[PDB]
Symmetry: C8
Subunit: 216 residues, 8 copies
């Protein structure tokens, strides 16, 4: 929920500017596509109250179920982030602009990969001959949205299969897991109210021992 | 409700830009009309709490009714998305711009399909002779809205027929289905409160066994 | 209420653009005036909880009353939509622009019906001689608002007559109808609470039969 | 309340454009001043729950009082609409622009009534000689606001007189009217709860007769 | 409260345009200063629930007190309206612009009163010689704000005196008035609940007499 | 509270325009600094429920205390208004612009006091020689803010002294005052409920005497 | 809280304009940095309900503790105001602009201190030779933010030390202080309810003595 | 929470302007990156209610645990501030602009470090030869975002490790700590209600001793 809402609204606040240099284009875009997905995965494992308990008095089946159910909810931000990035076209445009068919709809090996690398940067682009900048753009942003929809499809067709076979699920392990998660909470609330009554008997003997001073 | 509201507000956030190339126009528009409808269908089956139970101790009539009633609610986003796409004209304009009567209200086979393909792109369009760009536009966007209203009509005239004959419906199967859906919930709430009382008797023996340490 | 509010706010979101062609003008405007009214009528019959029950153990008088009262509420969107369309003038301007007195306040049969057809389109209009475009506009939008007020009047003078004679109404049939509509609801709420008690006696025997496994 | 709020906010949404033609000016303005007041009167009679009951077992004095009190609340929109229309000046400007003193603060009978008729239309007005357009405007909009304030005065000085003499009022008829309006409501609420208990005894015999099927 | 809030927010919605003609200036401004104050006075008498009761079984002292206390609350809009009108300067500028010292800080009797009358109208003003238009303005709007503050002072110094002597007040008449205003309300609430019990005994005999029809 | 909030938000709604004339500058600014403070003082005395009771059965000490505590709360708007007026600089700029050192940072006695008087009016100022208009401004608005801060200081250093000595205060008179203010309220609430029970015994005899008419 | 929120939002409403004169620059900025801090200190002492009680029956230790705890909360606005003023740079720019190294990154003693003094005033600055105005600005606003951060650091490193040693604190004096602050409140609420019962016995004898008049 | 929200919204209110001078660039940026993180750390220790209690009757293990858990929550603002500063590029651009490869994608040692230092300042930059200013920018802002993501990764991969080994944690010390934190609160609430009852017995003897004065 909030994790998935902070994944799409964290994309618009982060500015994508790319170097438009013939070697840094691909390296910069590969890392601004893979790293923040990997950060939203670890930030979903860290922030549920079972990461330490799995880190023995519990059956191996109950651990395997309680682990695989832990990861599957961490995969909602890593998937919503990669989809909004491919449906935008900025990351795909910078990484692949240097390899575009200039003969169809359109100098050594250098002087051309250095000219084509400035396509995503409108104020730097000089070579408006050999290619209109809006013809190379608007063609790489369509190949990017064909992949952004093939990813949402194959990913939704896979979350459907893991609700019909339900691997790593047995009713014996699903029941034993739901019981132990209840024992955790009740033992907590019982401990607190036993701490606020064994202390309240020492409070009354401390106050009247300190009400000895300010009464004379 | 929310599924249908996320279907119309997901259309304005997604930008439709099309390639304006004489072969990619039709392929790009066919997929930006069919794929996200197919994604909103699977995303409605996956997110109701009966997809696994249907995946035997239950009568075949009760399964067939509980299945056909499951799909019919998944068809509200796929229909609202295809209707708003045809009532906008952008998808129809790009896919059919290459085949427009240039003699009425108006070079080899090439040099013409490549000139006509840039009609939806105002900054790329060169051939302002042989056709005004706002005369070819404003004529394809009217054929698109005649189909967008013929689709809302024939689709509303079909949701009316399936409320008067009510196929795959019998009162015997409608009653048996509503009963089993109640047994699911009551067995759930009875299980939990039996788990928070069989554990609460072991809590009191654990706390005083751990209140053995911090009292001496 | 909501149906009537979704009828006026659905008019501003839908863009009226017309072809300004000498044959498509009238056909396009006739269908963008008649079809969405017909869609809001069927969408009011479909969405009340009596369309199937009327589709025999009930008196014929009670059916006729319960039918005619069903349609009269479906007529609030079809009337509010046709009124806002005539009080705007866009639909009337495109359908009748080709037949306007050019002699009063102002070439074969063609070259004139093709010149006059571009009046509603300001960027396409060439023939600024023989007619100022704002003189032909501002004269068709006044004939359109005389009809838009004659329609709201004759329609409000008819909803007044069907509250003073009240056809298809008898106190015998109005009373029998209000009773059967109460029997529908009470039989529903009685069925549910009988389903959550006959099942709750089988739940207790299932849980302790499944509390046999995770206790040893 | 709401009727009076929908009367002033319905004036700003409706656009006043007038033909600026030497014969349609007066006819168009006479109807855009008289018709929507007449529509707000019938729309206040239709929408109170006594229009049918007055359409005999009741004294003639009680009917006359209950009728005259019915109309007086329907007169709050027809008066607020005519006042906001005269305090704006647009309707008065178009209907009387053709008859303005051009000698004071300033061609056959035609060529002058056709020149003066375009005063309310700034883009059509040609005859900027013989009259400045803002001198003929700003003089007809002051005669319009002297009448708009003489109407609010004489109308408020009349609602004051019909609260001090109180015609068609007698304490005998005011008391008999307030009693019959209470008998209407109590007989309604008594009928419903007698319909949900005579039916609830047939529900229990229908459910267990339909709980005969899904129990074996 | 609301009357005083509708008095200041009704001033900004009403547009002050004045004729800038040498005879209509003073007449137009005298009436747009005196009439709407007189309308807000009668609209405060009409809308309190004692205007008819004063229009005999009650002592003359109790009537005189209950009348003079009735007017004093009607004087809050007539005073807030005249103050905001003088603190704005538009009404004072148009009525007195024709009589301004043109020798200090600066043609027959006509040709001068007709030139000076267009000072409040910036687009009509021709005589920018003999006077700068912003020098005649900005001098009449300062004499207008010296009077607008002398009016708020002498009016607040008078509402202070009528809270220290308190004319037309005696404790005998203030007590008799507060008692009769309580007898009005209690006799109302006692009448209603006596009307909903004498009718409820006839309802039960009507329903079972009409439950005679729809039971056989 | 509200009085102090209506004192600062009443300053921005009132427009300060000054005459820029060599004699009206000082008189206009002296009155737009002193009068509205004097109006907010009398408007705080008038609007507390003790102004009449002080206008004898009460000790002289109790009156003197209840008077001096009455004024001190009326001094919060007169002080917040004079401070915001000096911290703005407009009033100080117009009243003293005619006497500014034109030799330092820079014609008879006239022709100079009439040239300097137009400094606060940017569109009227002619003498841009002998002085830049933004050099005479920006120097009078700094002397105005040195006085606006010396006033807030000496006024806050005086509200601190009258909370440490507390003149016109004795605990005998503070206690007698708080008691009489309680007797006022309790005698009020006791009077009302004695008026709604001595009248309720006459209501029952009036209703059944008027239920004599509409029952036969 | 509110005092600290009114300290930062009172800075943006007050306009900093400085004279840009070679002697008034430093004096104006020294007072617009020191005075409003001193006003927010006295305005925090005045507005807590202990300033008079400290102005004897109470131990000297309890007074010293209750005084030093009184000042420490008055220091939150004086510190937040001086920090936001140094982190803005306007006050530092005007006071030190006259002494800036014009040789590094760049006429008698006069003609130079009078040229440099107009740096903070962009419309007055003439000497754009010998110095770019944005080079002298942007260098004084960096020395101002190095001091604004050294002040927030040394001030936060001092509020940390006075929470670890806690001077003027003893548990005997902290306990005696918290008790006397409770006796103040309980003696207040006990006094009031004793004033509304000794008066309520005289009310009943006054009302029936005044119900003697309006009953005959 | 609020500390972390005041860390990111305090970054946009503080303006980063840098000197663009060849020696102040690095010193200014090193301090606007390190100091406010150090201020948000001390401002998190100071504002929790245990900083004094740790400044002996408590076991050493319980102190070490209660200290290390105190710091870890103070590290959420210092980490969110350093991350948003590196993901923006302004601090990295000014500190390293003087050392940029001008040969790749592009005078003594001086005249070059003084030319390159003005890159972050667009209005001061002169040397648009030898380097385009948007080519040196857009290359330093990409090296800055590779470090801003390597910091969020290595910092999130470290908060994951300290939730799986959990150093400085033992269940004996975690239990003893949670108990003492409960004894603190209960001894507080017990002290107050013992102070409002030992005082309430002296109040009744003071009031009637002061009700001796104002009763005679
Ligand atoms: C506010 C929202 C913003 C608006 C929307 C914005 C538009 C977004 C548009 C569309 C988004 C729609 C996508 C939905 C997909 C379902 C999510 C999912 O997968 O989890 C499912 C797992 O199922 C899987 O195992 C599939 C995961 C495949 C691995 C992908 C790795 C991701 C990193 C890519 C690396 C490759 C890099 C290479 C890239 C070329 C969970 O299964 P479940 O049945 O739900 O059970 C859990 C129940 N629960 C849910 C209750 C916990
Ligand atoms: C916030 C909203 C946004 C604002 C509005 C925006 C404007 C939108 C304007 C107008 C939209 C109005 C349309 C309403 C239609 C009814 C929906 C429906 O069909 O479901 C009905 C099924 O009935 C059917 O079976 C018909 C479906 C036909 C198959 C269509 C496939 C869709 C993919 C096309 C592929 C072809 C591609 C080729 C294209 C050329 C459900 O029947 P029911 O009786 O309701 O029973 C269920 C009860 N329930 C509802 C309680 C569950
Ligand atoms: C948020 C709102 C937006 C703001 C306002 C926007 C401005 C709108 C301005 C003005 C709108 C005001 C109009 C009000 C009219 C009343 C409605 C009505 O008719 O129903 C009445 C039926 O009465 C009839 O039978 C008359 C219908 C005539 C047939 C018209 C067909 C419509 C399609 C035209 C095809 C022709 C095409 C050719 C065109 C040239 C109902 O009667 P009732 O007594 O009420 O009883 C029901 C009780 N109930 C109401 C409780 C259920
Ligand atoms: C949100 C508001 C918008 C803001 C304001 C906008 C600015 C508006 C400014 C100002 C408006 C102020 C006007 C107020 C007048 C009172 C209303 C009234 O008349 O009803 C009174 C009737 O009294 C009458 O009988 C007088 C009616 C005269 C007939 C007029 C016909 C109207 C059509 C003209 C055709 C002529 C065409 C020719 C034109 C040249 C009711 O009397 P009552 O004592 O109240 O008793 C009822 C009690 N009740 C009220 C509880 C039910
Ligand atoms: C929403 C707000 C807007 C935002 C802020 C805007 C920025 C404003 C900035 C700053 C304003 C801060 C000023 C605060 C001063 C305290 C007020 C005061 O004085 O009352 C104190 C009286 O104390 C006195 O007696 C001093 C009054 C001196 C006389 C001044 C006359 C005023 C007219 C000038 C004529 C000279 C003309 C010549 C001019 C050259 C009250 O004392 P107390 O101890 O409080 O006891 C009462 C308790 N009580 C408060 C509960 C009732
Ligand atoms: C509204 C928000 C704004 C929107 C977002 C904006 C975008 C932000 C994007 C991304 C931010 C995501 C980062 C999250 C990291 C976790 C925080 C953390 O570290 O604390 C963890 C400690 O764990 C550690 O010990 C690691 C700290 C390393 C030391 C860093 C020093 C910081 C100063 C750098 C100096 C170097 C300078 C040199 C620089 C080159 C806490 O561990 P825990 O397991 O949680 O246990 C505590 C439980 N608790 C949490 C309940 C208390």
């Amino acid at each position: 929920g909030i994790m998935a809402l902070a994944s799409a609204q964290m994309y618009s606040a982060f500015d994508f500017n790319c170097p438009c240099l013939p070697g840094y284009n691909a390296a910069y875009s590969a890392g601004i596509l893979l790293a923040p997905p990997l950060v939203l995965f670890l930030l979903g494992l860290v922030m549920n109250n079972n990461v330490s308990m799995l880190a023995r008095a519990k059956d191996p089946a109950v651990l395997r179920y309680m682990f695989c159910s832990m990861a599957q909810r961490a995969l909602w931000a890593p998937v919503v982030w990669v989809a909004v990035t491919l449906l935008d076209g900025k990351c795909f445009l910078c990484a692949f602009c240097t390899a575009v068919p200039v003969s169809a709809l359109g100098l050594p090996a250098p002087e051309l990969a250095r000219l084509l690398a400035r396509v995503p940067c409108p104020e730097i682009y000089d070579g408006d001959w050999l290619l209109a900048r809006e013809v190379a753009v608007r063609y790489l942003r369509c190949i990017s949205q064909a992949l952004g929809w093939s990813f949402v499809l194959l990913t939704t067709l896979l979350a459907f299969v893991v609700r019909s076979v339900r691997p790593c699920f047995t009713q014996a392990a699903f029941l034993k897991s739901k019981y132990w998660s209840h024992y955790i909470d009740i033992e907590r609330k019982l401990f607190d109210e036993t701490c606020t009554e064994h202390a309240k008997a020492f409070a009354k003997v401390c106050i009247q021992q300190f009400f000895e001073a300010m009464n004379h």
